[PDB]
């Protein structure tokens, strides 16, 4: 018992030595007499020293404290606590006014002084509002924009004419507008509106987490397009006339760069923007202290110089949003605020890094002006430098896919005047067919939270460009059609690895599938509500039948691929149907061995792909995806060689040659007709080596991630705490419910798809022979490719004929 | 062009009327003359009105503002900004001193006055520390505990003897100790230490999100156990002697209730705690304003009354933690702080809701005192009210599982003196074998973040009780063994649904599997480091061989179950091996039909289970899990009936009857030997109907979730913003890396397990017959069950013999 007593004695000796430890008993109900308390308070003199120290310390303010007080004032005004907001605003204004004297930098001194004066005036206005002498709804500090000289200006530059105010001053203003519809009601204006200019074309360049090189290339290409438009010959049949003429075209084009979040912008991108006079950190930090702005917009008529050539000036508005949001939110801000204020004629949308050729804008504007029935158009999407880096299989496969998709599908859809725009493409509309209901349908997701809509609507709007296209075509009391321009070439930079391709295709496939389902369900609105010609309605009905058949065939693609490969190759080897060899006798331990190996490999690969895709992100699993892709590619190459041998050994019956043409040679026929044939010759092998990887891997990973979507008393204090707890718990419960619904939806869809494919494959393998199934598949494929070839030929005839027959 | 001009004119007319909109140009480099600025400032008189309004408003302080200022002061002191902390503390102290006068409630007035005086004294001490007259390391406000009378006290109560201070006053103190090891260094003490009492037994009741009923039942059962210990007859061979005698036992027991988070405690639980005098919201809110405490502890010697019986007083310490953490954190606080201070002899751990019988503590203490080689013990775990609600299959299955596991496995492991404790059980240790290294191994997860350790260590410590048990057994330079007490019955409340059972078993299975792997790898430490008897080392080696074989068999359990069912039932039906019927001829379209149906159903069920488990949480998917479980249960019941028919039709050879006994009848033999036989008769059918559901569903869901684990200038402001951005980005990157590693680990483990099972099943089906595989399985199962039966019989002999042979 010695150690216990020793440790207790040690604790007791450590007890001695607001001291370290005080034990007190508070008696309730006595409430104390107000005689000893006063003397006890007056009996302590260290309070005088503490007060002296605090008073001495609090004499000199600082910039950081002033900014923090202004931030707290902004929060308090957001919570509608006007007394505290007024007090904190007064404190911050006085602090900044005092601080501005000490700063050595003249720019900082001027900015601080101006901000202090603005804050004091706002305090006066808020005091007047509190008094009730001035009555207003939801007061806010007055809008104030600051123009400052650009830090770096090029002495040697050539231009048509530039006022010094426009040339050297960059303007800035932070905005609070929570609903971008009310942008022009709150008093915000742009430099173009102030100066009297009325641009007719607007371009939006969405940006998020990008290097300087992509933005620089995009701006250089846009400047080249403007230069080409300027040098357009006058008084010519092909030339454009009107606002887009020469020597004044640069005044009719405005470029909006809408960043997605100040916390995610690449620092080098910010440095490059500051170089061209479109960003300044000190101005943003000082002038946005008290406003609590949603986004800050800079304005400048930038001049760019490349080597010895001076590009034309570009009117640019850079809107940087404080918090991260979706790209649809950037389009919300752009469309609503800037289109409603400026009221343009055409509205073009592109991403960052899209490098246009010198004639893209000319062709788009020419189509829009000549046709006058076009409510929307989309240009051709291409891969930058396809011939270079030809050793990479992914790049060549993507190049072949882009070319074939553009030619066949875009031409066929554009013949009927209804286009499903590829995501990431460079598109354009006119701000007369998207004025009302189409934009409401576009932004319904932002207007209403996902909980009310559900998972189907969120997945549908994951790619909402097709929604806008359909709303344009099927608009009530209007007949707007779409068009595809072959000469508006825009070159992007596709991913060089399988994993980035997997993620990109995941987003693409989810959006496309659910947009297609929405279009199929709502196709009736074209007849019920729109007012087209009868011929147009009949053509739409024909295209609807074709669309139904094509989608139904596409849904059962993995099963058909497996059945075709299995039947042809492996039951030609096992049952001696390969025409260039006789496998009749053999060991008989090899005839079944090939089929067993093929079935086991296919099933194990599919199981592994499903397990990986439903689980970990496709970034750690690079090796496994590469291995599965390599196995499938080798299998497909072997199948292609065997099929070629079988075809060449056949005596080439008329039916065989006709089916071969209408099945495979449609690609080469269309490519030769449109003149883009060498790309097909170069990339056909690379695409063939990746067909099964495309189908299986991309569809499985896309379907496995359908849920991935974006002066009170004490009792007053107690009630406030309880209310906060209740709100927190209800918010957590709502989030859990949303997650539950999305997960259930994605699981149901994946199970339906996978089990439908498995049941189809089993019931065809067990109950059907190769002689009773392959002719049906050949007929189906030949029909689809014949329709696509007819559409492509029709588009070529239209593009080479309508110019002559424009009179009729 | 009329609408455009009209809208521009509308905007211009809306322009007119800190006003609504001001456009200014700030010239940089001028810096202004200090002549006009002073006159301009003095030219505005509304500032006088604003100052008067602010001065008038700021006269009267409030409770909420004082508490907010104290919170800000606590944050500033946490950031080591002593000037601002001192200023805010002074402001809060003065505000509370002024506020205390106005309050009508005497208790609130007294608490506010005392807190204000304490805050002022702390301000004086901090000012002295800033001056440097007093030099100290990391200053903090002095520890101050408040004792207040209990709101509700029972006038009619019977007890041995209670001082009025102990009977009527409840004590409270908030603690700041960040590392619980330094609890006694900072000056914190408990009431037992102050009063001079030295308890010898401590009990910890971990609580999180529980209703009042469970806590009330646990406290009533503990009081009953204390009453039984008190009434123990003196001067008897069986009776305990020493500190645990009668009439003073209640002074030697302390109960620690460690809540997990103030934001998650059920409000009714807080109300019940306040009823028995263990919680008060006003005291917590007032006295914890400035300290910024990590957890707040209340102390009381509670008296409980049930109906007409008055239970014995219980010394209770309720420690409520501010933020949520793991249960291991609660054990960290309990063990380190309270054990290191009190220095007890025994330390018992239980959950909340565990209802003990009247003799559990007596049996545990008797074993600990008599054996003296026991470093740890665990009691029997049972299901409350098993016979009632017998219609529910899940409850009966769990009852059978608990009984069989306890008897067979616990007896076999306890014979060798090494036990793997069931999670959630009621266990005990002595605070002499866990003093040093075992607790360090226990808390290594809390000491080091998971990023350094990895996923294996986190999954291992998900159930870290087995780690503590192994460290106790294999402690260096000591020979501590464990023991299992059959008579320490603790009854829990098992879940009534399949989904809660699924989640609970997920946690159990992950912890058990990885703890078993750790034990297998580190078994060598018993021979290399520990100092046991040679006989003990040989017994440990034998048990190690048995453990290896048992774990290896358990890993391949689903494949063996599938093979046994398929072979016996379905290749007895197809190949005419069912002895009670002749299926030789038949349609021949049915002989293969049964096998095809069985294979397809099994494969589809497994695929659906994997897809669901890897995806959505098992709460929305109740119907699918129920359907799969029902299908598997019907299949298992049919297989059981067919097997019984086959066995009874056989002429009962000697080998057959011996294998049948040593395979199945071991359960009934052991149950009859230990006297718990009727439960087996009642629940055998219910457990048989859920064997396959257990195996497949629980193992798959457990393996699919291995990743689920818990005065500067402007340039100074710019640098601070940049530093904050860098820290935020690095934190996000680190979190992403951790998620990547955990997901990769879980995917690799799941793939290994599933593919090993599939390959084993395929290579046994294709290359082995029923006559060359079933005898091996029978031999393996018979060997395992024979070893388990021998262990159970040995434990029974020891428990009924060692009492006589205690002399030798
Ligand atoms: C979905 C996906 O994996 N896309 C990848 C794809 O870009 P990918 O071309 O597929 O698509 P993006 O998502 O990058 O394009 C959407 C457009 O909106 C912008 N945007 C993007 C995200 C956002 O939250 N808000 C926003 O406004 C983008 O900058 C772009 O202008 O290849 C890039 C490399 O070549 C990768 O870096 C991208 O991760
Ligand atoms: C993991 C799981 O799904 N367990 C469920 C199981 O309890 P189950 O008995 O399986 O296990 P618990 O996780 O509830 O038990 C852990 C012990 O520590 C406490 N604890 C719990 C969580 C925590 O974050 N910190 C903490 O300290 C618990 O109160 C308990 O005393 O059946 C209960 C209903 O009968 C459910 O409500 C639980 O959700
Ligand atoms: Mn891009
Ligand atoms: Mn529980």
Author numbering:
A (entry chain A), B (entry chain B): 23 to 39, 49 to 741, 762 to 859
Task: Show sentences the authors wrote.
To obtain the donor substrate UDP-GlcNAc-bound structure, we mutated the catalytically important residue Glu495 to alanine, which allows the enzyme to trap the substrate in its substrate-binding site. The uridine moiety of UDP-GlcNAc is fixed within the tub of the reaction chamber, which consists of a loop region from Thr237 to Glu241 in the GT domain of the enzyme, through a series of interactions with the residues in this region. The GlcNAc moiety appears to be solvent-exposed and oriented away from the catalytic site. Superposition of UDP-GlcNAc-bound PsChs1 with apo-PsChs1 showed no significant local or global structural differences (root mean square deviation of 0.54 Å for 693 Cα atoms). An N-terminal sequence (residues 23–39), unresolved in the PsChs1 apo structure, appeared as an α-helix in the UDP-GlcNAc complex. This helix extends into the opposite protomer and interacts with the LG subdomain through hydrogen bonds. Structural comparison between the apo and UDP-GlcNAc-bound states revealed that residues Pro38, Leu39 and Pro40 are in different locations, indicating that the N-terminal extension of the SP subdomain in the UDP-GlcNAc-bound state adopts a different conformation. The Mn2+ ion in the UDP-GlcNAc-bound structure only forms charge interaction with the phosphate groups, with a bond distance of more than 3.5 Å, which is much weaker than a coordinate bond. The donor substrate-bound structure shows an additional N-terminal region from residues 23–39. It forms charge interactions with the diphosphate group of either UDP-GlcNAc or UDP in all the substrate-bound, product-bound and UDP-bound structures.
